[PDB]
């Protein structure tokens, strides 16, 4: 069930990856740009790169081919967005609020507050294993 | 609910991550030992690398890595676990097998049908929102 959950999540980010490709940048571009805009100002690169799954070099790497696109600024360092970024997010973001509606069609308002439960007691179950 | 689901599946492979220390295994490490045990024989570093969710030459350090911990042997290259390997992997297995099980409490039998069909039911609707 974990691994079908792994699968599910995988081919989510895959369909919107797919439906990005005008915008020119690879999954791990994109990930990292959304990455930076829902975190809170000022990460760390090792915050930022935990939040996107990759390590550590690759994030620097990520990073690094993102300023060659104007698409991030590192004048401090902190991480900002540039300006020519903000259009790209907007457009990536409604991308990501429609596909989510799309996904979730045929789907009951029923089902849907359950799994945001389910998942949730899951995460807690998963919170108090820890501990332990 | 996407990142509500990506971050569920981060933090179980972190709870199994969590018991697995004493294995002295980084997670891309036991990660990619997992899915060399679960794919069927003969896959290419390609198919290893996107099962997994890592670069291509991230999977190329960790099999080298592999290697040099008598995990892995590429004689041939086809890419098969050792025999050291093989008691560890069903260890892994039975940390995983009980985990699950664990993170399951509380969940009743009606809940966890249901999880498994709107898993499903999402995934269909990715599958065909691709096409389209």
């Given at each position: 069930l974990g691994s079908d959950l792994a699968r599910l999540v995988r081919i989510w980010r895959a369909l919107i990856d797919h439906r990005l490709?005008?915008?020119?940048?690879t999954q791990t571009h994109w990930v990292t740009l959304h990455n930076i805009h829902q975190?809170?100002?000022?990460?760390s690169q090792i915050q930022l790169a935990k939040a996107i799954g990759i390590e550590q070099p690759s994030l620097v790497r990520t990073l690094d081919q993102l300023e060659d696109k104007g698409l991030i600024s590192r004048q401090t360092k902190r991480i900002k967005l540039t300006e020519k970024a903000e259009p790209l997010i907007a457009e990536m973001e409604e991308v990501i609020h429609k596909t989510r509606g799309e996904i979730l069609a045929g789907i009951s308002s029923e089902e849907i507050e359950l799994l945001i439960k389910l998942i949730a007691k899951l995460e807690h179950n998963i919170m108090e294993l820890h501990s332990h």
């Open positions: 490709k005008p915008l020119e940048l975190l809170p100002p000022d990460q």
